[model samples]
Target: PSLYRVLILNDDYTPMEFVVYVLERFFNKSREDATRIMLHVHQNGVGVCGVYTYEVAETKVAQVIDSARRHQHPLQCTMEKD
Candidate 1:
């Protein structure tokens, strides 16, 4: 398996709670981990979710964007092979 990085991009419009929820619901991260990532993104403007295969990372990013759009949020995610 290959590893990739899921990068969460921060924007002033997106809510932290929504970011945490997306991490928990879509990425299958626990609340603590989600909260940590949310805080990191809030403070630093971005955060790496984890390493995954290229397909999985791309799918995850798509799913996150889809879900965020469904909720009328502007959260964006991208994946990079590492």
Candidate 2:
């Protein structure tokens, strides 16, 4: 089966703490892992959060966007076939 990668794009205004929070809340990441990934995103401009099938990946992208909006953050999420 094909898989897709869920990615988060780094932004200037989105707090690093918020990124870690999102990773924990939405992606079920541990604090250490979340911090590591968040830092990677900060430095690299983009980071992969997880991999899933098409439907799951799309759903996660939407949920991430909704969650960010609800929190008034402009963080962006996207998915790509992998």
Candidate 3:
């Protein structure tokens, strides 16, 4: 199957704790792994959470956006071919 990389973008306003929580909850990352990725994004401006098939990646992106909105956050997620 074709694969897509789901990425999170960094912004000043989104709490690091929230990003870690999102990664743990939605991406199924370990707390340590989530914190590493969140910190990487904080420093580098972007980080890949995971790679998945087209449908899954698309759904994850949508879910991240919706979840962020629900929490009144500005966090952003996107996907690309990998």
Ranking by TM-score, best first? 3, 2, 1
lDDT of 2 by residue, 11-75 (tens): 99988999999888778899999999999999999999988999988988998899899989999
Worst 10 residues of 3 by lDDT: 12-21
Clashing pairs in 3: none
User: In candidate 3, what are the lDDT values of residues 1-82, reduced to their tens digit?
Assistant: 7799999999989889999999998899999999999999999999999999999999999999999989999999999999
lDDT of 2 at 13: 91
Superposed Cα deviation of residue 11, candidate 2 (Å): 0.4
Tens-digit lDDT string for candidate 1 (12-69): 9988899999999878899999999999998998899877888888889999999999
Number of clashes recorded per candidate: 0, 0, 0
Task: Estimate the overall C-alpha local distance difference test score of candidate 2.
Answer: 0.93
The candidates, ranked best first by lDDT, are 3, 2, 1
| Model 3: per-residue Cα lDDT at residue 20 | 97
Candidate 1, residue 64: Cα displacement in angstroms equals: 0.2
Candidate 3 RMSD to the correct structure? 0.6
Scored by lDDT, the top model is: 3
